[PDB]
Design a protein around this ligand. Structure first.
Ligand code: CHL
Ligand code: CLA
Ligand code: CLA
Ligand code: CLA
Ligand code: CLA
Ligand code: CLA
Ligand code: CLA
Ligand code: CLA
Ligand SMILES: CC(/C=C/C=C(C)/C=C/[C@@]12O[C@]1(C)C[C@@H](O)CC2(C)C)=C\C=C\C=C(C)\C=C\C=C(C)\C=C\[C@@]12O[C@]1(C)C[C@@H](O)CC2(C)C
Ligand SMILES: CC1=C(/C=C/C(C)=C/C=C/C(C)=C/C=C/C=C(C)/C=C/C=C(C)/C=C/C2=C(C)CCCC2(C)C)C(C)(C)CCC1
Ligand SMILES: CCCCCCCS[C@@H]1O[C@H](CO)[C@@H](O)[C@H](O)[C@H]1O
Lengths: 98, 40, 199, 153, 197
């Protein structure tokens, strides 16, 4: 009886809002301090040409720098939450505690 | 006399005397209090 | 003063801080930064515990239920809430969970953009509309009173939890009335000594 | 009772074991004169078996589905006589021995050649030390507080 | 300073200055001074408690045998009915002793910490010796001479031995101390420890 489209859209919207306005600063200040490296230098600097970061992909015109990767991550979280709600509401599970 | 007392204080002689006394004590305890599985 | 008369006080606790009675046997606050974090954590904990005690006591005193019973309308598929004997139209678990998560996540955030160390514990401004904090001496003594009342509220919360665990299906006010009925027989004794005469 | 075991005073397998032991002992009795010394010795064994089984019944032991006593170790207050009290007595005797050994090793450490008192034991010194283990818990505790128990290297 | 065993020399650390010194330490428990300072306090408090305990077990049984009063035996007074139930009494005892014994311990650790009371800061315990507070604890102002301390320690040691005797006698006979004494004195030569074994 729960509309799948409404639940999925609302969960994705809420997750994107949280990622853009609430948890943005923490995530950015944490990724700033965690860059993978081997023997004191990054993987690309070591010689791994397949480990180069995509500068042309992560850039965006958002005022705070929200990009497509953030959209994918927060949308995946929202979809997971939405489908958890739909799958947990359809079943008739009753934990008989009381 | 002194030398014999020194010899009787050597490790093997003292060991056999001590373990003989212990064995006798345990044997007599088991003779008078046999088949003990618990402590009442 | 001192928490343990006749005991030297630790070097990292000199009594300048509000409610500083030199209590740190395990040495958790030796590092200054950890001590500063612990101070704000303690004040934040004290305020929540102080808010909790009236909210645990008054509803049961009014006969509205019990601080443990009031949470069991959930765990029931059709469960709906109740406020002062009045059903809450939106009082269903999936809605209240989402609202609580969003509101508390938003308010706990932007509590964290405050970087001034003194104002992480005592922000003031919109949180001090009446201006009790303008006078410094009064501000310091009110800080001492806040911490001291908060510690008592914290102890009362553990009292509530352990009383609930020890005597299931009972509430703090019910426990107080039962003790006041027969104080010399309704005590902690029959619980630490659980009705087991060893002889 | 505990773990599905029944007390040995109730279990029929225990009584059946007792009956079969006496029957096995009584078969060899047939090969001797009723007044002979071997007949007197097997009768003493029969009485010993009867006393053993009666004691196992009286002490309140639990028996399995095989008729044999089973020990309860978890800490039950009605089964302390099987592990707890004997264990305390063992821990008192072993600590006594260890403490008397430690004191003797300490007493001979500061000598010219202390390896000669380890193969030829100074018996009077040992006699002095031996009876200090009767209060070994108190001394062992007290050198823990002061710091004379553990070498801090 | 007497000799507990005439001929045996006294240990070096037992100087004859402490009250009740008879050179009795065959097992070398008090060789370390830090241990001796603790054992003095332990002996004092144990003797003081054993004194009261022995009086409490003995005297009401003597007065019960004479008919003046009728109270249960010391080993039977536990399961009697009182106004407060055993568990409540134990909890009250635990709280009160947890206070007073920590107050006493603070004095053992350093002599002069807990002389002043918290509630009425006007008052304070005058400087004294460890184990001998006095002032309030000595309301009648009896002088703490060496003779008095020696008498206290002797009577306390006798009381501890009496307590141990009471416990073993009840464990091996099942009756009270004074009735054991009466049974022994009634016919001394057939009522001894041998006849109970
Ligand atoms: C000086 C310490 C002390 C001694 C030597 C005793 C002695 C005794 N108490 Mg006891 N009590 C003591 C402290 C206290 N008691 C009690 C309250 C009771 C009660 C209610 C009972 C006893 C009982 C007993 C007896 C059974 C002991 C036993 O076999 O249980 C084994 C226990 C352990 C091995 C521990 C025993 C003679 C029992 C009794 O009276 O039997 C006839 C009994 O019912 N006591 C309180 C609380 C007020 C104490 C706190 O101070
Ligand atoms: C770690 C292994 C182990 C353990 C725990 C035991 C334990 C026991 N054995 Mg056993 N045994 C073992 C190895 C072991 N044995 C081995 C390897 C052999 C082969 C040689 C035997 C051969 C053996 C025989 C032949 C017998 C036992 C018996 C016993 C029981 C003795 C009770 C007793 O005498 O109490 C009384 C003793 C004391 C109370 C000790 C007192 C010590 C001092 C003096 C106390 C005084 C100061 C305080 C006890 C349950 C006897 C028994 O009755 O079994 C049911 C018995 O007949 N055992
Ligand atoms: C930490 C703070 C805290 C928390 C989490 C709660 C939580 C709760 N309180 Mg409560 N309360 C508190 C402090 C708190 N209280 C204080 C300080 C007081 C004293 C004024 C009260 C007085 C109080 C009463 C009198 C009642 C509750 C009730 C309730 C329950 C229903 C909530 C509801 O439907 O409200 C909905 C509120 C809104 C939608 C607000 C918007 C308008 C809920 C478990 C009710 C209860 O127990 O029902 C069984 C109830 O009747 N509370
Ligand atoms: C494997 C871990 C483990 C450990 C360390 C203990 C330890 C203990 N148990 Mg225990 N117990 C265990 C598992 C364990 N138990 C299990 C699995 C069971 C289920 C059968 C029990 C059932 C049990 C009972 C029924 C009792 C104990 C008791 C005790 C205590 C012994 C009395 C004592 O020293 O007074 C301190 C001791 C703390 C006794 C007690 O008084 O505990 C407070 C007691 O009466 N235990
Ligand atoms: C003074 C005697 C004494 C003392 C206090 C200790 C103490 C210790 N030994 Mg040890 N040990 C001893 C003698 C002693 N041992 C002897 C003689 C041997 C050679 C057989 C060993 C071989 C040994 C090994 C292989 C291990 C220990 C370990 C240990 C430690 C753990 C307890 C243990 O496993 O015990 C077990 C003890 C034994 C198996 C040996 C006991 C031998 C007898 C009972 C001692 C007799 C002493 C002496 C003859 C009596 C003095 C008389 C004097 C008054 C005249 C503990 C610190 C363990 C360890 O380091 O882990 C922490 C370990 O792995 N010991
Ligand atoms: C709790 C009991 C207790 C304690 C702590 C002490 C403590 C002390 N006594 Mg003492 N004493 C006691 C009971 C006690 N006594 C009793 C009952 C008697 C009568 C027999 C005596 C008779 C006595 C004499 C005649 C002398 C002392 C002396 C001393 C002091 C040095 C000896 C020492 O280190 O003992 C340490 C004692 C212990 C650590 C207690 C061990 C108790 C264990 C559990 C033994 C078990 C007893 C029983 C067999 C069970 C020390 C302050 C000497 C001194 O100079 O005094 C000023 C001295 O000359 N005592
Ligand atoms: C033979 C018993 C006896 C003796 C001679 C002493 C002797 C002493 N005690 Mg003492 N005491 C005892 C038992 C004893 N105590 C007991 C059992 C306790 C535990 C309650 C105490 C608790 C205690 C404290 C807390 C203090 C003393 C102090 C003193 C000293 C000065 C008081 C005095 O002269 O008492 C003289 C003692 C008597 C004349 C004995 C009278 C016998 C009574 C009346 C029996 C009552 C009947 C009874 C209920 C049954 C002195 C060294 C004080 C001190 O050292 O001051 C610096 C101090 O502060 N004692
Ligand atoms: C404090 C001193 C003291 C006194 C006066 C008594 C007196 C008595 N005890 Mg006794 N007893 C005591 C301590 C004492 N006991 C101790 C510490 C223990 C534990 C080992 C025992 C264990 C014990 C048992 C198991 C039995 C007695 C029994 C008896 C009674 C008759 C048999 C007898 O005395 O021989 C036995 C006496 C002893 C084994 C005591 C020896 C140990 C003490 C410390 C001797 C110290 C002597 C002391 C200096 C004398 C002080 C005298 C003074 C009061 C004037 C008698 C009334 C028997 C009884 O009740 O039957 C009627 C009995 O069966 N006692
Ligand atoms: C405190 C004490 C007893 C206190 C008793 C109390 C409160 C009794 C209370 C009750 O009765 C009443 C009031 C009323 C009842 O209804 C209830 C109970 C509860 C039953 C006994 C101490 C008892 C203490 C004792 C017996 C200590 C003995 C120690 C000895 C002998 C040590 C000797 C040595 O240590 C030295 C001296 C030198 C070393 O070198 C050699 C050795 C030998 C090791
Ligand atoms: C531009 C712009 C804008 C807009 C934006 C938007 C609108 C965005 C969107 C976005 C989005 C819309 C996103 C989405 C995302 C999603 C995702 C990313 C998903 C994912 C999914 C998943 C991951 C799934 C999984 C799964 C599966 C597969 C199976 C089933 C189960 C599960 C669920 C597990 C605005 C106006 C603001 C402003 C500015 C301009
Ligand atoms: C029972 C305790 C006393 C037992 C004394 C037995 C002899 S004591 C014996 O004496 C020898 C010198 O004669 C020493 O060399 C030796 O170390 C010593 O143990």
């Amino acid at each position: 009886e729960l509309n799948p489209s409404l639940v999925i859209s609302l969960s994705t919207g809420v997750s994107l809002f949280l990622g853009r306005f609430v948890f943005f600063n923490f995530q950015r200040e944490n990724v700033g301090k965690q860059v993978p490296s081997q023997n004191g230098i990054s993987h690309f600097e070591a010689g791994d040409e397949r480990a180069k970061e995509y500068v042309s992909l992560l850039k965006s015109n958002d005022p705070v720098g929200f990009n497509i990767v953030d959209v994918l991550a927060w949308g995946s979280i929202g979809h997971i939450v939405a489908y958890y709600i739909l799958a947990t509401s359809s079943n008739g599970y009753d934990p008989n505690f009381f | 006399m002194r030398d014999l007392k020194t010899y009787l204080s050597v490790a093997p002689v003292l060991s056999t005397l001590w373990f003989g006394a212990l064995a006798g004590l345990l044997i007599e305890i088991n003779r008078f209090f046999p088949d003990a599985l618990t402590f009442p | 003063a001192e928490w343990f008369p006749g005991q030297p006080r630790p070097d990292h606790l000199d009594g300048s801080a509000p409610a500083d009675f030199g209590f740190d046997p395990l040495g958790l606050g030796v590092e200054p930064e950890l001590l500063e974090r612990y101070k704000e954590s303690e004040v934040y904990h004290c305020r929540w515990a102080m808010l909790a005690v009236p909210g645990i006591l008054v509803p049961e005193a009014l006969g509205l239920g019990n601080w443990v019973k009031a949470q069991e309308w959930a765990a029931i598929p059709g469960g709906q809430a109740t406020y002062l004997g009045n059903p809450v139209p939106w009082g269903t678990l999936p809605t209240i969970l989402v609202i609580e998560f969003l509101a508390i996540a938003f308010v706990e955030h932007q509590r964290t953009l405050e970087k001034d160390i003194e104002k992480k514990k005592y922000p003031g401004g919109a949180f001090d509309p009446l201006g009790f904090s303008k006078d410094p001496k009064k501000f310091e003594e009110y800080k001492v009173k806040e911490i001291k009342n908060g510690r008592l509220a914290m102890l009362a919360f553990v009292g509530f939890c352990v009383q609930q665990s020890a005597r299931p299906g009972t509430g703090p006010v019910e426990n107080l009335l039962s003790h006041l009925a027969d104080p010399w027989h309704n005590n902690i004794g029959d619980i630490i000594i659980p009705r087991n005469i060893s002889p | 009772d505990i773990s599905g075991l029944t007390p040995c005073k109730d279990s029929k397998q225990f009584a059946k074991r007792e009956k079969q032991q006496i029957k096995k002992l009584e078969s060899s009795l047939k090969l001797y004169a009723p007044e002979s010394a071997p007949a007197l010795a097997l009768n003493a064994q029969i009485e010993k078996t009867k006393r053993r089984f009666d004691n196992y019944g009286k002490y309140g032991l639990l028996c399995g589905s095989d008729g044999l006593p089973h020990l309860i170790v978890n800490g039950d207050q009605r089964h302390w006589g099987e592990f707890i009290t004997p264990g305390i007595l063992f821990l008192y005797i072993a600590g006594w021995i260890g403490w008397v050994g430690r004191s003797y090793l300490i007493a001979i450490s500061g000598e010219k050649k202390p390896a000669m008192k380890e193969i030829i034991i100074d018996v009077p010194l040992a006699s002095r030390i031996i009876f200090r283990g009767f209060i070994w818990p108190v001394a062992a505790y007290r050198e823990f507080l002061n710091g004379d128990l553990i070498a801090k290297d | 300073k007497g000799e507990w065993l005439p001929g045996l020399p006294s240990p070096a650390y037992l100087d004859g200055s402490l009250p009740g010194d008879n050179g009795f330490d065959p097992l070398g428990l008090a060789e370390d001074p830090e241990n001796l300072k603790w054992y003095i306090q332990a002996e004092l408090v144990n003797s003081r408690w054993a004194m009261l305990g022995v009086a409490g077990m003995l005297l009401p049984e003597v007065f019960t045998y004479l008919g003046i009063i009728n109270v249960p035996k010391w080993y039977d007074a536990g399961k009697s009915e009182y106004f407060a139930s055993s568990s409540t009494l134990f909890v009250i005892e635990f709280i009160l002793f947890h206070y007073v014994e920590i107050r006493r311990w603070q004095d053992i650790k350093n002599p002069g910490c807990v002389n002043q009371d918290p509630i009425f800061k006007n008052y304070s315990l005058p400087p004294h010796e460890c184990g001998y507070p006095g002032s309030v604890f000595n309301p009648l102002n009896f002088e703490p001479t060496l003779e008095a301390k020696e008498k206290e320690l002797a009577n306390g040691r006798l009381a501890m031995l009496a307590f141990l005797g009471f416990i073993v006698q009840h464990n091996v006979t099942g009756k009270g101390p004074f009735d054991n004494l009466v049974q022994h004195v009634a016919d001394p030569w057939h009522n001894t420890i041998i006849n109970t074994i």
